Amino acid sequence: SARSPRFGVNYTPSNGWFHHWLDFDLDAVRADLDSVAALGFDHVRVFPLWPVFQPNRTLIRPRAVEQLAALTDAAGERGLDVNVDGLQGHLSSFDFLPAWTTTWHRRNLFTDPDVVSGQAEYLRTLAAALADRPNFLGMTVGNEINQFSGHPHPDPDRVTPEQAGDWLRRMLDACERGAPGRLHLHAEYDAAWYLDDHPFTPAHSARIGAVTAVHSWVFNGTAQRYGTRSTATAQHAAYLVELAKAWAREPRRPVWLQEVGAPAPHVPAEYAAEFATATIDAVLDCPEVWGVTWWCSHDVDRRLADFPELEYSLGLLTQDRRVKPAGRAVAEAVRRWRTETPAPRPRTTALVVDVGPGDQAPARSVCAPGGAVFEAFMRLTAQGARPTTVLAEHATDADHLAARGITEVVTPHDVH
Amino acid sequence: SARSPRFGVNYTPSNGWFHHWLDFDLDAVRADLDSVAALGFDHVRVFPLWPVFQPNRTLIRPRAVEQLAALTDAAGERGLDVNVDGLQGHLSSFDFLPAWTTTWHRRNLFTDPDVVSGQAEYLRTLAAALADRPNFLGMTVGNEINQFSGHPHPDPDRVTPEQAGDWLRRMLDACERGAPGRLHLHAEYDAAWYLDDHPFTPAHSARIGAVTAVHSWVFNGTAQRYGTRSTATAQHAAYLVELAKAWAREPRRPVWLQEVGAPAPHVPAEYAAEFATATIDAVLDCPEVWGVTWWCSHDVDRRLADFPELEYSLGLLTQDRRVKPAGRAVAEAVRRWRTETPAPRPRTTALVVDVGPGDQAPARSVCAPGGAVFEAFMRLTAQGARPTTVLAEHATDADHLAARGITEVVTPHDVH
Ligand SMILES: CC(=O)N[C@@H]1[C@@H](O)[C@H](O)[C@@H](CO)O[C@H]1O
Ligand SMILES: CC(=O)N[C@@H]1[C@@H](O)[C@H](O)[C@@H](CO)O[C@H]1O
């Protein structure tokens, strides 16, 4: 009954980046997706710009929607399924916020009834427009929208965890209404697991939406503390996968590694291929992985200003559509895992994750790089123990353990 | 040598409002400008959306520029000259701010060297693209950009007056560089004359840029304090014209009434025609008026949300291009003033304007509705004295007075 992982890329348009919606060129998209499918991927994750699609609360532009459908059709012709992220929102250090949510109309993104009603109509419209596309996977509410909810954001839209979970439900309700039965989820960046009192929580990620989405980025302190060529750096995606399982109510709830990339300087370009192989191999030794989706397809145009340096070189391909060695290595790992490798065995040893109550997760920073749970997991991993995780409050739950096939339970104090 | 006033409208596209740049339709623009020229106007004031034209600091979209040129050409065919406002920025309660100026990239609009360098390139590019258009008037830096500089803005980019004047110079330098010899100016809303310690000052408006631009809006407290059918309400545009002259170094520096409109409920629709006639008649009794430019050509689409109620009905035409009675009245006033009315006589009586030092204007609120200078001017006007204004520091300057033809000088204390 073992789950079979899918392989895709986050689509970063080579001509004009996500600004290409302002000058939409289907032939340029066709060429981008051509070089994507030639690498053997089976899906793309694609990004509308929210204020370009909804420049006024009650103006959702049909032409923008039509363009998204044409993109989805071009991908379908090429054997690529499409997940669409709705609320961007945040992309690569930039916040794209509609004028009707800011300054003179500043209205909290998660709690204002008019903005939330506008967000719902937006998501529902996209989902409904794509509902007749057989290659349309479903919606992700918005890329790492939790980054708006608190520190370190310079101007956050603050919310309680209950408010955040309620907002997520309404957003996913809208996706479900536009495209019933599709794969609708939300995706939060790693503050949801690592930052104490961050409003978006691990329970939100593991108990709302169809699958848990994780974004694995070793610039978060991991590569800095442990080195580029290290257990922790190579295993960081696998760790996020197994950590996220602890809060899941369903024992076989899949986990989607929706973002993973090789950020220089933390991963120099010369080590990107090697890093990509080890990371993919390591995470695919985890059961129930829904898929691996690399960030990103194409380098960002170097004529575009003010990106953090790491953002420019994250592509599997260059801006002129040449395949990088790291692109070649990911394609090779995809090919090997689709055909030549067996399913991963169950992880029967569980590391106890004690995070405080854990619905609220007030001390989740023990899971962050340098934390006791983090280092206990990498130590076990290095010892060959192939660990999963379990919450302290379920660590003696014979039904939880047996449902998961867990036969051994250890704490970080046990690991030392 | 008397100056002859021009007549135009602020172009508010009927299909999609200023969001029409996202779905640019030249035939829809042609039809809009057709109904404009049929009313007898000779120019339009037109508004790019800054973040649509410059979505990234070093991406100024050539297609957006091409669209602006096609709009300018369509207008030229119809005998309409074009002023282009650059930095929007602010339009009708909405702030359109590029992602590269906000939150994670928050960089002060008036002082950050990278943003200011980006603004310069933007203005220079627009001006240069239109420089070969014989109907291209010139640039206005940006619509009421001073609203970003302080209270009551909820999130201002604060600046000292010296910083604001320096920024204006650099912005106009860029316009001049792209289109030498053209009519380049800046336009600040009435806080520049009315709000104590507002960073943009009357000296900035009267001593930087080719002409002084004023925006006359009787919802600023005037209609509320004095009534819709009153001297002060009818004369408010004329007052702003004559007030703005006090800070001018050149005695014949023209003043452009770049915005004037009839906002309901302060001016009910049934009184818009009558209000428009009286306002135009009153301001055109002021010498050196560069022109009168009505806000706006077309009602805002009522399907667009979150505008202040007054914004929807400010058009001379409805959203379906029917001419309103107020449109008919403005066209009639234009026709009469172009052919049937003599030039206004000089205003030889000057009201003293004591504002504190006045370069800095720390007590300019004496010019605001309810202020001593304001009410002294309306009282003189009602008495038939046809007043101009003079700064306290120049009130005994025999050369200033004679250069202006001023033969009588009175203070508000004199008027009582
Ligand atoms: C402010 C900032 O740059 N935040 C980044 C975000 O852009 C990125 O998507 C995320 C990936 O995990 O990492 C965050 O640290
Ligand atoms: C915050 C706000 O609505 N400000 C308005 C502005 O939209 C308008 O252009 C201006 C005209 O003078 O009047 C201001 O009061």
Side-chain angles (χ1 to χ4, degrees), chain A residues 22-23 56-58 61 63 93 95 99 103-105 107 147 152 303 305-306, chain B residues 22-23 56-58 61 63 93-95 99 103-105 107 147 152 303 305-306:
Chain A
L22 301 174
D23 299 290
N56 173 282
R57 182 153 60 87
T58 52
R61 292 183 38 244
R63 278 186 75 260
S93 85
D95 286 336
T103 69
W104 293 114
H105 308 264
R107 287 173 287 186
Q147 76 101 40
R303 305 171 281 171
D306 297 310
Chain B
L22 301 174
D23 299 290
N56 173 282
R57 182 153 60 87
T58 52
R61 292 183 38 244
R63 278 186 75 260
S93 85
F94 297 93
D95 286 336
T103 69
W104 293 114
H105 308 264
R107 287 173 287 186
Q147 76 101 40
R303 305 171 281 171
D306 297 310

mmCIF file of all heavy atoms in Angstrom, chain A residues 22-23 56-58 61 63 93 95 99 103-105 107 147 152 303 305-306, chain B residues 22-23 56-58 61 63 93-95 99 103-105 107 147 152 303 305-306:
data_model
loop_
_atom_site.group_PDB
_atom_site.id
_atom_site.type_symbol
_atom_site.label_atom_id
_atom_site.label_comp_id
_atom_site.label_asym_id
_atom_site.label_seq_id
_atom_site.Cartn_x
_atom_site.Cartn_y
_atom_site.Cartn_z
ATOM 1 N N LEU A 22 2.011 40.541 -16.724
ATOM 2 C CA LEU A 22 1.769 41.858 -17.306
ATOM 3 C C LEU A 22 2.008 41.880 -18.808
ATOM 4 O O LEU A 22 1.499 42.775 -19.490
ATOM 5 C CB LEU A 22 2.662 42.902 -16.641
ATOM 6 C CG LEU A 22 2.478 43.044 -15.131
ATOM 7 C CD1 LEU A 22 3.532 44.013 -14.573
ATOM 8 C CD2 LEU A 22 1.076 43.538 -14.824
ATOM 9 N N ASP A 23 2.788 40.932 -19.329
ATOM 10 C CA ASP A 23 3.115 40.844 -20.746
ATOM 11 C C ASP A 23 3.024 39.377 -21.167
ATOM 12 O O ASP A 23 3.981 38.782 -21.650
ATOM 13 C CB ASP A 23 4.521 41.382 -21.041
ATOM 14 C CG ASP A 23 4.693 42.851 -20.684
ATOM 15 O OD1 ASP A 23 4.112 43.708 -21.375
ATOM 16 O OD2 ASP A 23 5.432 43.148 -19.720
ATOM 17 N N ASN A 56 -8.736 45.175 -7.919
ATOM 18 C CA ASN A 56 -9.739 45.809 -7.082
ATOM 19 C C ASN A 56 -10.573 44.691 -6.471
ATOM 20 O O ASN A 56 -10.778 43.660 -7.107
ATOM 21 C CB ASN A 56 -10.604 46.783 -7.903
ATOM 22 C CG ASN A 56 -11.771 47.339 -7.112
ATOM 23 O OD1 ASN A 56 -12.781 46.659 -6.919
ATOM 24 N ND2 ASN A 56 -11.639 48.586 -6.652
ATOM 25 N N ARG A 57 -11.045 44.893 -5.236
ATOM 26 C CA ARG A 57 -11.701 43.802 -4.511
ATOM 27 C C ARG A 57 -12.741 43.070 -5.360
ATOM 28 O O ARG A 57 -12.836 41.837 -5.314
ATOM 29 C CB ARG A 57 -12.356 44.324 -3.236
ATOM 30 C CG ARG A 57 -13.005 43.201 -2.433
ATOM 31 C CD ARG A 57 -13.059 43.551 -0.969
ATOM 32 N NE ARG A 57 -13.832 44.770 -0.742
ATOM 33 C CZ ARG A 57 -15.154 44.790 -0.576
ATOM 34 N NH1 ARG A 57 -15.875 43.669 -0.617
ATOM 35 N NH2 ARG A 57 -15.761 45.936 -0.364
ATOM 36 N N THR A 58 -13.510 43.794 -6.168
ATOM 37 C CA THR A 58 -14.512 43.141 -7.000
ATOM 38 C C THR A 58 -14.133 43.127 -8.474
ATOM 39 O O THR A 58 -15.015 43.032 -9.332
ATOM 40 C CB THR A 58 -15.882 43.799 -6.807
ATOM 41 O OG1 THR A 58 -15.759 45.217 -6.986
ATOM 42 C CG2 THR A 58 -16.392 43.513 -5.397
ATOM 43 N N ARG A 61 -9.824 39.699 -12.890
ATOM 44 C CA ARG A 61 -9.701 39.918 -14.333
ATOM 45 C C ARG A 61 -9.894 38.632 -15.122
ATOM 46 O O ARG A 61 -9.072 37.711 -15.000
ATOM 47 C CB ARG A 61 -8.325 40.522 -14.655
ATOM 48 C CG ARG A 61 -8.137 41.955 -14.145
ATOM 49 C CD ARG A 61 -6.769 42.527 -14.557
ATOM 50 N NE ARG A 61 -6.414 42.101 -15.907
ATOM 51 C CZ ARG A 61 -5.381 41.328 -16.215
ATOM 52 N NH1 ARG A 61 -4.555 40.908 -15.271
ATOM 53 N NH2 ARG A 61 -5.166 40.990 -17.483
ATOM 54 N N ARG A 63 -9.293 37.994 -18.229
ATOM 55 C CA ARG A 63 -8.144 37.731 -19.091
ATOM 56 C C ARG A 63 -6.991 37.100 -18.313
ATOM 57 O O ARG A 63 -6.324 36.190 -18.813
ATOM 58 C CB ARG A 63 -7.694 39.015 -19.771
ATOM 59 C CG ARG A 63 -8.510 39.356 -21.008
ATOM 60 C CD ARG A 63 -7.942 40.565 -21.756
ATOM 61 N NE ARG A 63 -6.730 40.257 -22.519
ATOM 62 C CZ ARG A 63 -5.490 40.518 -22.109
ATOM 63 N NH1 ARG A 63 -5.274 41.093 -20.931
ATOM 64 N NH2 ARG A 63 -4.456 40.205 -22.882
ATOM 65 N N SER A 93 11.254 37.383 -1.296
ATOM 66 C CA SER A 93 11.498 38.581 -0.493
ATOM 67 C C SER A 93 10.538 39.726 -0.837
ATOM 68 O O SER A 93 10.534 40.730 -0.127
ATOM 69 C CB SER A 93 12.944 39.113 -0.590
ATOM 70 O OG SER A 93 13.094 39.960 -1.720
ATOM 71 N N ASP A 95 6.714 41.401 -1.225
ATOM 72 C CA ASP A 95 5.297 41.285 -0.893
ATOM 73 C C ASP A 95 4.482 41.977 -1.982
ATOM 74 O O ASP A 95 4.664 43.175 -2.230
ATOM 75 C CB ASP A 95 5.003 41.906 0.469
ATOM 76 C CG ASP A 95 5.502 41.055 1.631
ATOM 77 O OD1 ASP A 95 5.654 39.828 1.462
ATOM 78 O OD2 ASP A 95 5.721 41.619 2.724
ATOM 79 N N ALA A 99 -3.731 47.173 -3.615
ATOM 80 C CA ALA A 99 -3.950 48.493 -3.035
ATOM 81 C C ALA A 99 -5.145 48.498 -2.094
ATOM 82 O O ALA A 99 -5.186 49.295 -1.148
ATOM 83 C CB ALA A 99 -4.146 49.529 -4.143
ATOM 84 N N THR A 103 -2.495 50.764 3.467
ATOM 85 C CA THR A 103 -2.564 52.153 3.931
ATOM 86 C C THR A 103 -3.998 52.628 4.153
ATOM 87 O O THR A 103 -4.622 52.244 5.146
ATOM 88 C CB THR A 103 -1.816 53.086 2.968
ATOM 89 O OG1 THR A 103 -2.516 53.171 1.724
ATOM 90 C CG2 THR A 103 -0.375 52.576 2.728
ATOM 91 N N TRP A 104 -4.528 53.449 3.241
ATOM 92 C CA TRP A 104 -5.861 54.015 3.411
ATOM 93 C C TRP A 104 -6.935 52.936 3.493
ATOM 94 O O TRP A 104 -8.003 53.184 4.058
ATOM 95 C CB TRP A 104 -6.184 54.985 2.260
ATOM 96 C CG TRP A 104 -5.310 56.241 2.257
ATOM 97 C CD1 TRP A 104 -4.388 56.602 1.311
ATOM 98 C CD2 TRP A 104 -5.282 57.272 3.259
ATOM 99 N NE1 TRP A 104 -3.797 57.798 1.658
ATOM 100 C CE2 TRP A 104 -4.327 58.227 2.851
ATOM 101 C CE3 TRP A 104 -5.971 57.478 4.457
ATOM 102 C CZ2 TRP A 104 -4.038 59.366 3.610
ATOM 103 C CZ3 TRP A 104 -5.699 58.623 5.199
ATOM 104 C CH2 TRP A 104 -4.742 59.552 4.767
ATOM 105 N N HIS A 105 -6.682 51.759 2.919
ATOM 106 C CA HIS A 105 -7.558 50.605 3.047
ATOM 107 C C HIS A 105 -6.932 49.475 3.852
ATOM 108 O O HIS A 105 -7.304 48.314 3.652
ATOM 109 C CB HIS A 105 -7.956 50.093 1.665
ATOM 110 C CG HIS A 105 -8.511 51.159 0.774
ATOM 111 N ND1 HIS A 105 -9.865 51.385 0.637
ATOM 112 C CD2 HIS A 105 -7.890 52.084 0.004
ATOM 113 C CE1 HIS A 105 -10.054 52.390 -0.200
ATOM 114 N NE2 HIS A 105 -8.871 52.843 -0.584
ATOM 115 N N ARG A 107 -6.477 46.604 5.847
ATOM 116 C CA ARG A 107 -7.465 45.701 6.424
ATOM 117 C C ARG A 107 -6.808 44.340 6.588
ATOM 118 O O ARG A 107 -6.288 43.791 5.611
ATOM 119 C CB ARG A 107 -8.718 45.599 5.534
ATOM 120 C CG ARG A 107 -9.607 46.855 5.561
ATOM 121 C CD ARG A 107 -10.751 46.774 4.542
ATOM 122 N NE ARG A 107 -10.288 46.934 3.163
ATOM 123 C CZ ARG A 107 -11.103 47.013 2.112
ATOM 124 N NH1 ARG A 107 -12.421 46.949 2.288
ATOM 125 N NH2 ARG A 107 -10.610 47.169 0.885
ATOM 126 N N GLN A 147 4.074 34.145 6.573
ATOM 127 C CA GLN A 147 5.095 35.177 6.767
ATOM 128 C C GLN A 147 4.482 36.554 7.034
ATOM 129 O O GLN A 147 5.163 37.432 7.570
ATOM 130 C CB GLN A 147 6.027 35.237 5.547
ATOM 131 C CG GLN A 147 5.434 35.917 4.318
ATOM 132 C CD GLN A 147 5.902 37.363 4.125
ATOM 133 O OE1 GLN A 147 7.069 37.691 4.340
ATOM 134 N NE2 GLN A 147 4.991 38.225 3.682
ATOM 135 N N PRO A 152 9.434 37.668 11.890
ATOM 136 C CA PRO A 152 10.145 38.941 11.738
ATOM 137 C C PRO A 152 9.556 39.910 10.703
ATOM 138 O O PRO A 152 10.282 40.823 10.311
ATOM 139 C CB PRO A 152 11.534 38.487 11.290
ATOM 140 C CG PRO A 152 11.217 37.298 10.399
ATOM 141 C CD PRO A 152 10.061 36.604 11.078
ATOM 142 N N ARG A 303 18.942 40.958 -14.713
ATOM 143 C CA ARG A 303 18.666 42.379 -14.897
ATOM 144 C C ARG A 303 17.593 42.880 -13.941
ATOM 145 O O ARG A 303 17.308 44.084 -13.920
ATOM 146 C CB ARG A 303 18.252 42.642 -16.348
ATOM 147 C CG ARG A 303 19.284 42.136 -17.353
ATOM 148 C CD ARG A 303 18.767 42.203 -18.778
ATOM 149 N NE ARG A 303 17.871 41.089 -19.075
ATOM 150 C CZ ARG A 303 17.139 40.981 -20.181
ATOM 151 N NH1 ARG A 303 17.196 41.916 -21.122
ATOM 152 N NH2 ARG A 303 16.355 39.927 -20.352
ATOM 153 N N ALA A 305 16.260 43.753 -10.258
ATOM 154 C CA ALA A 305 16.989 44.274 -9.108
ATOM 155 C C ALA A 305 16.338 43.878 -7.788
ATOM 156 O O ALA A 305 15.154 43.527 -7.727
ATOM 157 C CB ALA A 305 17.094 45.805 -9.176
ATOM 158 N N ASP A 306 17.142 43.974 -6.722
ATOM 159 C CA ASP A 306 16.773 43.954 -5.299
ATOM 160 C C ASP A 306 16.418 42.576 -4.753
ATOM 161 O O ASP A 306 15.980 42.492 -3.585
ATOM 162 C CB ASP A 306 15.615 44.910 -4.994
ATOM 163 C CG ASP A 306 15.988 46.366 -5.262
ATOM 164 O OD1 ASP A 306 17.063 46.805 -4.772
ATOM 165 O OD2 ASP A 306 15.230 47.047 -5.988
ATOM 166 N N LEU B 22 -3.868 46.978 -17.370
ATOM 167 C CA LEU B 22 -3.714 45.527 -17.316
ATOM 168 C C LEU B 22 -4.401 44.828 -18.479
ATOM 169 O O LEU B 22 -4.059 43.682 -18.787
ATOM 170 C CB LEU B 22 -4.274 44.986 -16.004
ATOM 171 C CG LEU B 22 -3.624 45.547 -14.741
ATOM 172 C CD1 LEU B 22 -4.376 45.034 -13.503
ATOM 173 C CD2 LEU B 22 -2.162 45.144 -14.687
ATOM 174 N N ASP B 23 -5.375 45.483 -19.112
ATOM 175 C CA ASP B 23 -6.128 44.928 -20.229
ATOM 176 C C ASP B 23 -6.286 46.019 -21.288
ATOM 177 O O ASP B 23 -7.388 46.394 -21.671
ATOM 178 C CB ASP B 23 -7.510 44.427 -19.791
ATOM 179 C CG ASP B 23 -7.448 43.310 -18.760
ATOM 180 O OD1 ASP B 23 -7.043 42.187 -19.113
ATOM 181 O OD2 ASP B 23 -7.829 43.553 -17.594
ATOM 182 N N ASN B 56 9.395 46.144 -11.213
ATOM 183 C CA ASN B 56 10.653 45.895 -10.532
ATOM 184 C C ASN B 56 11.545 47.100 -10.801
ATOM 185 O O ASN B 56 11.463 47.698 -11.872
ATOM 186 C CB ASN B 56 11.297 44.587 -11.027
ATOM 187 C CG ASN B 56 12.690 44.373 -10.471
ATOM 188 O OD1 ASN B 56 13.655 44.984 -10.938
ATOM 189 N ND2 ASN B 56 12.804 43.497 -9.469
ATOM 190 N N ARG B 57 12.388 47.459 -9.827
ATOM 191 C CA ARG B 57 13.149 48.707 -9.934
ATOM 192 C C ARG B 57 13.816 48.877 -11.299
ATOM 193 O O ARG B 57 13.823 49.978 -11.863
ATOM 194 C CB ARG B 57 14.202 48.788 -8.835
ATOM 195 C CG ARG B 57 14.977 50.101 -8.889
ATOM 196 C CD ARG B 57 15.506 50.469 -7.528
ATOM 197 N NE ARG B 57 16.404 49.438 -7.011
ATOM 198 C CZ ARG B 57 17.711 49.394 -7.270
ATOM 199 N NH1 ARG B 57 18.294 50.308 -8.047
ATOM 200 N NH2 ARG B 57 18.441 48.435 -6.749
ATOM 201 N N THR B 58 14.353 47.802 -11.870
ATOM 202 C CA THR B 58 14.996 47.913 -13.173
ATOM 203 C C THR B 58 14.182 47.270 -14.287
ATOM 204 O O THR B 58 14.747 46.887 -15.314
ATOM 205 C CB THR B 58 16.406 47.316 -13.128
ATOM 206 O OG1 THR B 58 16.345 45.992 -12.580
ATOM 207 C CG2 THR B 58 17.301 48.183 -12.247
ATOM 208 N N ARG B 61 8.470 48.578 -18.220
ATOM 209 C CA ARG B 61 7.926 47.723 -19.279
ATOM 210 C C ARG B 61 7.766 48.476 -20.591
ATOM 211 O O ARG B 61 6.951 49.410 -20.665
ATOM 212 C CB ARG B 61 6.569 47.149 -18.842
ATOM 213 C CG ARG B 61 6.660 46.137 -17.695
ATOM 214 C CD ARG B 61 5.280 45.548 -17.350
ATOM 215 N NE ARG B 61 4.495 45.324 -18.560
ATOM 216 C CZ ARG B 61 3.360 45.943 -18.857
ATOM 217 N NH1 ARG B 61 2.834 46.816 -18.014
ATOM 218 N NH2 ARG B 61 2.740 45.669 -20.000
ATOM 219 N N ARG B 63 6.190 47.642 -23.282
ATOM 220 C CA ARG B 63 4.815 47.563 -23.766
ATOM 221 C C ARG B 63 3.911 48.571 -23.058
ATOM 222 O O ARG B 63 3.053 49.193 -23.691
ATOM 223 C CB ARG B 63 4.279 46.149 -23.596
ATOM 224 C CG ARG B 63 4.699 45.210 -24.715
ATOM 225 C CD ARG B 63 4.024 43.840 -24.599
ATOM 226 N NE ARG B 63 2.617 43.852 -25.003
ATOM 227 C CZ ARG B 63 1.586 43.909 -24.160
ATOM 228 N NH1 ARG B 63 1.790 43.967 -22.848
ATOM 229 N NH2 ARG B 63 0.344 43.907 -24.629
ATOM 230 N N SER B 93 -8.132 57.656 -3.185
ATOM 231 C CA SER B 93 -8.023 56.992 -1.887
ATOM 232 C C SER B 93 -7.129 55.747 -1.935
ATOM 233 O O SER B 93 -6.827 55.192 -0.880
ATOM 234 C CB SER B 93 -9.382 56.591 -1.275
ATOM 235 O OG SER B 93 -9.806 55.330 -1.774
ATOM 236 N N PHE B 94 -6.706 55.278 -3.102
ATOM 237 C CA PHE B 94 -5.855 54.093 -3.172
ATOM 238 C C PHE B 94 -4.388 54.489 -3.353
ATOM 239 O O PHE B 94 -4.072 55.377 -4.146
ATOM 240 C CB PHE B 94 -6.274 53.186 -4.325
ATOM 241 C CG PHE B 94 -7.667 52.615 -4.189
ATOM 242 C CD1 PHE B 94 -8.752 53.258 -4.757
ATOM 243 C CD2 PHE B 94 -7.875 51.425 -3.512
ATOM 244 C CE1 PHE B 94 -10.041 52.719 -4.644
ATOM 245 C CE2 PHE B 94 -9.154 50.875 -3.398
ATOM 246 C CZ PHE B 94 -10.238 51.530 -3.969
ATOM 247 N N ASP B 95 -3.491 53.791 -2.656
ATOM 248 C CA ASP B 95 -2.054 53.936 -2.870
ATOM 249 C C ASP B 95 -1.563 52.756 -3.703
ATOM 250 O O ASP B 95 -1.717 51.598 -3.296
ATOM 251 C CB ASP B 95 -1.308 53.999 -1.540
ATOM 252 C CG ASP B 95 -1.490 55.328 -0.818
ATOM 253 O OD1 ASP B 95 -1.782 56.344 -1.482
ATOM 254 O OD2 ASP B 95 -1.318 55.356 0.419
ATOM 255 N N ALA B 99 6.129 46.772 -5.171
ATOM 256 C CA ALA B 99 6.619 45.861 -4.143
ATOM 257 C C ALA B 99 8.042 46.201 -3.727
ATOM 258 O O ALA B 99 8.434 45.934 -2.585
ATOM 259 C CB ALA B 99 6.544 44.417 -4.642
ATOM 260 N N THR B 103 7.417 46.994 2.758
ATOM 261 C CA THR B 103 7.734 45.979 3.768
ATOM 262 C C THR B 103 9.199 45.551 3.731
ATOM 263 O O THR B 103 10.067 46.302 4.186
ATOM 264 C CB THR B 103 6.801 44.767 3.632
ATOM 265 O OG1 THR B 103 7.089 44.059 2.423
ATOM 266 C CG2 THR B 103 5.320 45.218 3.639
ATOM 267 N N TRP B 104 9.485 44.362 3.193
ATOM 268 C CA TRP B 104 10.846 43.837 3.187
ATOM 269 C C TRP B 104 11.805 44.743 2.423
ATOM 270 O O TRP B 104 13.011 44.703 2.679
ATOM 271 C CB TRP B 104 10.874 42.422 2.582
ATOM 272 C CG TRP B 104 10.142 41.381 3.433
ATOM 273 C CD1 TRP B 104 9.005 40.694 3.099
ATOM 274 C CD2 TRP B 104 10.504 40.939 4.753
ATOM 275 N NE1 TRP B 104 8.645 39.847 4.124
ATOM 276 C CE2 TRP B 104 9.548 39.982 5.151
ATOM 277 C CE3 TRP B 104 11.543 41.260 5.631
ATOM 278 C CZ2 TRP B 104 9.597 39.353 6.399
ATOM 279 C CZ3 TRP B 104 11.603 40.616 6.863
ATOM 280 C CH2 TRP B 104 10.635 39.671 7.231
ATOM 281 N N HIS B 105 11.296 45.534 1.477
ATOM 282 C CA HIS B 105 12.076 46.543 0.778
ATOM 283 C C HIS B 105 11.642 47.963 1.113
ATOM 284 O O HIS B 105 11.843 48.865 0.293
ATOM 285 C CB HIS B 105 11.989 46.321 -0.730
ATOM 286 C CG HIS B 105 12.324 44.924 -1.146
ATOM 287 N ND1 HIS B 105 13.584 44.555 -1.570
ATOM 288 C CD2 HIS B 105 11.571 43.799 -1.164
ATOM 289 C CE1 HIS B 105 13.584 43.265 -1.856
ATOM 290 N NE2 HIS B 105 12.379 42.779 -1.601
ATOM 291 N N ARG B 107 11.600 51.457 1.575
ATOM 292 C CA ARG B 107 12.645 52.446 1.331
ATOM 293 C C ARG B 107 11.966 53.773 1.037
ATOM 294 O O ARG B 107 11.128 53.844 0.130
ATOM 295 C CB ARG B 107 13.551 52.024 0.159
ATOM 296 C CG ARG B 107 14.500 50.859 0.491
ATOM 297 C CD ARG B 107 15.265 50.367 -0.744
ATOM 298 N NE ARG B 107 14.414 49.622 -1.672
ATOM 299 C CZ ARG B 107 14.869 49.000 -2.759
ATOM 300 N NH1 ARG B 107 16.168 49.035 -3.048
ATOM 301 N NH2 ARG B 107 14.036 48.330 -3.553
ATOM 302 N N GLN B 147 0.845 63.608 -0.366
ATOM 303 C CA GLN B 147 0.017 62.868 0.589
ATOM 304 C C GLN B 147 0.788 61.729 1.262
ATOM 305 O O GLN B 147 0.376 61.258 2.325
ATOM 306 C CB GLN B 147 -1.237 62.320 -0.109
ATOM 307 C CG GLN B 147 -1.000 61.103 -0.996
ATOM 308 C CD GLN B 147 -1.390 59.775 -0.340
ATOM 309 O OE1 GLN B 147 -2.405 59.677 0.350
ATOM 310 N NE2 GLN B 147 -0.595 58.738 -0.587
ATOM 311 N N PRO B 152 -2.326 63.391 7.335
ATOM 312 C CA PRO B 152 -2.948 62.253 8.020
ATOM 313 C C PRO B 152 -2.632 60.872 7.429
ATOM 314 O O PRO B 152 -3.370 59.941 7.751
ATOM 315 C CB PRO B 152 -4.438 62.554 7.863
ATOM 316 C CG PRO B 152 -4.505 63.164 6.474
ATOM 317 C CD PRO B 152 -3.254 64.000 6.359
ATOM 318 N N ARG B 303 -19.271 48.868 -10.298
ATOM 319 C CA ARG B 303 -18.955 47.507 -9.875
ATOM 320 C C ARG B 303 -17.604 47.426 -9.178
ATOM 321 O O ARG B 303 -17.234 46.352 -8.689
ATOM 322 C CB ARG B 303 -18.989 46.568 -11.084
ATOM 323 C CG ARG B 303 -20.315 46.628 -11.837
ATOM 324 C CD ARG B 303 -20.259 45.867 -13.148
ATOM 325 N NE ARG B 303 -19.588 46.641 -14.187
ATOM 326 C CZ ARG B 303 -19.242 46.165 -15.381
ATOM 327 N NH1 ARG B 303 -19.512 44.908 -15.711
ATOM 328 N NH2 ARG B 303 -18.634 46.955 -16.254
ATOM 329 N N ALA B 305 -15.139 48.263 -6.125
ATOM 330 C CA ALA B 305 -15.435 48.396 -4.704
ATOM 331 C C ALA B 305 -14.443 49.307 -3.992
ATOM 332 O O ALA B 305 -13.329 49.553 -4.469
ATOM 333 C CB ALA B 305 -15.437 47.022 -4.016
ATOM 334 N N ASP B 306 -14.870 49.781 -2.815
ATOM 335 C CA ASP B 306 -14.084 50.431 -1.757
ATOM 336 C C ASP B 306 -13.687 51.872 -2.053
ATOM 337 O O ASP B 306 -12.919 52.456 -1.257
ATOM 338 C CB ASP B 306 -12.817 49.640 -1.415
ATOM 339 C CG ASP B 306 -13.140 48.260 -0.847
ATOM 340 O OD1 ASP B 306 -13.974 48.184 0.095
ATOM 341 O OD2 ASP B 306 -12.590 47.262 -1.365
#
